[PDB]
């Protein structure tokens, strides 16, 4: 009597509404086991191509043989860690304490912030160290931003600004490590945080679909057979039982679909290069040509071309890193045709 079947779509990604921030904000950070280091990076989505690879999986019967793998090319020029923020531990949880800022700024950063003309870094740094001595110091993160002007395919000169955690080492060593990076002007690269063959989590705001119906948005069935000709095609049977007499939020309905934040786990970094190697004949469709620092990600990444995406080291990897996998071939074939 009515075979069962799972509900339509997950309830874990709700409410499905427009993201308030087109720059994604990481909900979690990797653990502190390693040496002091910045816990993420960012870049701009270009497109897709494929790659022939040598299977490095020790547990595959195909180990050593060639495999074709899909890749999303992301332009990953260096970013600037322009400040160091410290969090205090309080009964209400973590709160920003103070910030140590550089005096050295990229020319376009004033399109976004009101850049400090007058700051006292040492005072801030002192406040931080006093906190550490009191054992109230709870976290250390860098205020960082991208340099889209270094990516001509992307129309924006206005930088995207995001805060990224610094993990690893003792708190003291971590503090020093953070301060060293910032004072320079903060310039750092994909090279510095990530190595090819490692797993990253990639976060991004998905392609916007605007308003869509429950069939697309939730995966409910279309009306079937005779039912499909009666005046109803794409609508669900009912909004609920007689009682409770109200519509539950769990029933699939139309609404904003796409343009949500997603964090996708365990994305293998196939290569971190620079130059025009990955670029496709004719240009990446609706994007442009890539010549410059880039990252190849196994498979797919959330978002349309030009969208900012964020990297962090995998917080829950299934597999051991197999470093620097061998790339036999990278297709430059036109994506038109």
């Amino acid at each position: 009597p009515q075979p069962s079947r799972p509900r339509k779509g997950s309830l874990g990604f709700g409410p499905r509404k427009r993201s308030t921030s087109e720059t994604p904000r990481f909900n979690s950070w990797p653990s502190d086991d390693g040496q002091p280091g910045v816990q993420g990076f960012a870049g701009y989505k270009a497109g897709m191509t494929h790659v022939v690879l040598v299977n490095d999986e020790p547990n595959s019967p195909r180990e050593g043989m060639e495999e074709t793998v899909p890749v999303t090319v992301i332009e990953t020029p260096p970013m600037r860690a322009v400040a160091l923020r410290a969090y205090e531990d309080t009964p209400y949880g973590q709160r920003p304490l103070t910030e140590v800022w550089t005096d050295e700024f990229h020319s376009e950063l004033d399109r976004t912030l009101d850049v400090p003309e007058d700051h006292d870094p040492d005072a801030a740094e002192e406040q931080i160290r006093d906190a550490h001595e009191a054992g109230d110091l709870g976290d250390l993160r860098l205020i960082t931003h991208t340099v889209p002007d270094a990516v001509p395919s992307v129309p924006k000169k206005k930088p995207d600004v995001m805060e990224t955690r610094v993990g690893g080492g003792s708190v003291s060593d971590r503090l020093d490590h953070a301060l060293d990076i910032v004072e320079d002007g903060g310039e750092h690269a994909m090279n510095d945080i990530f190595r090819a063959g490692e797993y990253a989590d990639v976060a991004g705001v998905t392609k916007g679909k605007g308003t869509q119906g429950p069939v697309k948005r939730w995966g409910v069935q279309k009306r079937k057979g005779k039912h499909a000709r009666q005046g109803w095609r794409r609508r669900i049977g009912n909004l609920g039982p007689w009682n409770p007499s109200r519509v539950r939020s769990t029933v699939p309905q139309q609404g904003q679909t796409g343009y949500h934040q997603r964090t996708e786990l365990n994305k293998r970094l196939i290569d971190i290069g620079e130059g025009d190697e990955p670029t496709v004949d004719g240009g990446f469709v609706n994007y442009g040509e890539v010549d410059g620092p880039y990252t190849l990600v196994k498979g797919s990444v959330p978002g349309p071309d030009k969208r900012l995406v964020r990297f962090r080291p995998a917080v829950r990897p299934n597999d051991q890193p197999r470093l620097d996998p061998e790339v036999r071939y990278v297709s430059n074939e036109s994506n038109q045709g």
Binding site: H50, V52, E66, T68, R328, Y329, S331, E333
Partner: protein
């Protein structure tokens, strides 16, 4: 990546693309594209198609 010619038009098949059709008798045909498969399915011979490397 061993490069193969398309058994129809004769251009080099891009690695990691295309389709092999296995015939009834076990003979084998590598196609570089749908365009070529479909042209073949019309019973057209590539040597008679001017745009084809074979014909050229």
């Amino acid at each position: 990546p061993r490069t193969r010619e398309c058994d129809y038009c004769g251009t080099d098949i891009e690695p990691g693309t295309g389709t092999m059709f296995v015939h009834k008798d076990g003979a084998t045909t590598h196609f570089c594209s749908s365009k070529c498969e479909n042209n073949a399915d019309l019973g057209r011979e590539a040597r008679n198609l001017e745009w084809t490397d074979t014909a050229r």
